[PDB]
Amino acid sequence: SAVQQKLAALEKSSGGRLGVALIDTADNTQVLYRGDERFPMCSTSKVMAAAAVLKQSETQKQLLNQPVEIKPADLVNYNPIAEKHVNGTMTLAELSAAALQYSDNTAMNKLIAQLGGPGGVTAFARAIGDETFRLDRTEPTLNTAIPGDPRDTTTPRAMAQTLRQLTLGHALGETQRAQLVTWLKGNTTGAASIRAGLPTSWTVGDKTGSGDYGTTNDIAVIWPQGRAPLVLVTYFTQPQQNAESRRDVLASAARIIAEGL
Ligand SMILES: *[B@@]1([O])O[C][C]([C][O])O1
């Protein structure tokens, strides 16, 4: 289609490898570009860790208010929020919000620990029918994004379907789902990515990701004003280990998708 031609041309212009999956919940149609290829998730994996804890809170009604101690040893490479609470505590809700809205790596590692390790995050994926998602490492090493390395990867198709279920479907309880949507809508790191390719009137909840090999990711739920919502996943990675982030590519891919709806 016209859109796949333009996405292919965008990819060629960028020098990297682009993965796109759009789900139009209006008619359940899908637009895929390298939709079944594996990409490093980087911090887009934090959505799965947060959703897994949310699922736990369906039975442990007070779980999200459980305080968790932040020790100096817990601090890794990027902890904008956890930094503010060293030698203090953060609730599991505050850590979930920090992981999603500020991409705090210490917060993500606490969520993984709460779930019993990376295997616990991956287990949740399988429980909701995602057989592609795999989380193998903790922060920060899950961002190495080595070409061909299957660790800590998923496919755009798989992530789009799963994000739909978590935010628009009923993989989570009603209150948990709404909390996840609220967190995603208040993301602070996505202004230059998918959001930048879309009309300013559209409401967007997203989670960005970045890592080595210039890996630049964004996954988003989109609520156009007066229209069925959309799920859009954009994954991008490059052949040089030290390549710069290319959020402009994500914005351009979203703009190309928006043209047509
Ligand atoms: B994720 O990918 O988003 C930011 C941090 C950087 O290490 O991880």
Cα(109)–Cα(148) distance, integer angstroms: 24
Is the Cβ–Cβ distance between 221 and 161 less than 8 Å? no
CATH number of 1-261: 3.40.710.10
Distances 23 to 141, 159, 213, 240 between C-alpha atoms, Å: 30, 11, 27, 31
Cα(81)–Cα(11) distance, integer angstroms: 35
The verdict on whether 14 is a catalytic residue reads: no
Which among 244, 109, 217, 241 has a CA at the least distance from the CA of 153? 217
Q: Please, what's the b/e burial string for 3-13 (b: 16 or more CB within 10 A of its CB; e: otherwise)? A: beebbeebbee
Which among 140, 81, 143, 144 has a CA at the least distance from the CA of 107? 81
**Residue the block writes with tokens 């796949």:** 4
The domain spans of the chain are 1-261
Pocket test for ligand 1, best of 76, 101, 103 (most atoms within 8 A of CB): 103
Residue 163 is encoded by which pair of tokens? 């994000």
Burial (CB < 10 A; 0-12, 13-18, 19+), residue 23, is buried
Cα(171)–Cα(54) distance, integer angstroms: 10
Question: What are residue 215's DSSP bridge partners?
Answer: 211
Q: Is 145 left (phi over 0), alpha (psi -120 to 50) or beta?
A: left
Pocket test for ligand 1, best of 41, 45, 78, 250 (most atoms within 8 A of CB): 78
User: Ligand 1: residues within 6 Å at CB?
Assistant: 42-43, 77-78, 103, 105, 140, 143, 209-211
Span from the CA of 211 to the centroid of ligand 1 (angstroms)? 6
Burial (CB < 10 A; 0-12, 13-18, 19+), residue 142, is buried
**Resolution of this entry, Å:** 1.8
| Pairing assessment for the beta strands 230-237 and 17-24 based on DSSP bridges | antiparallel
What angle separates helix 46-57 from helix 92-101, to the nearest 10 degrees? 150
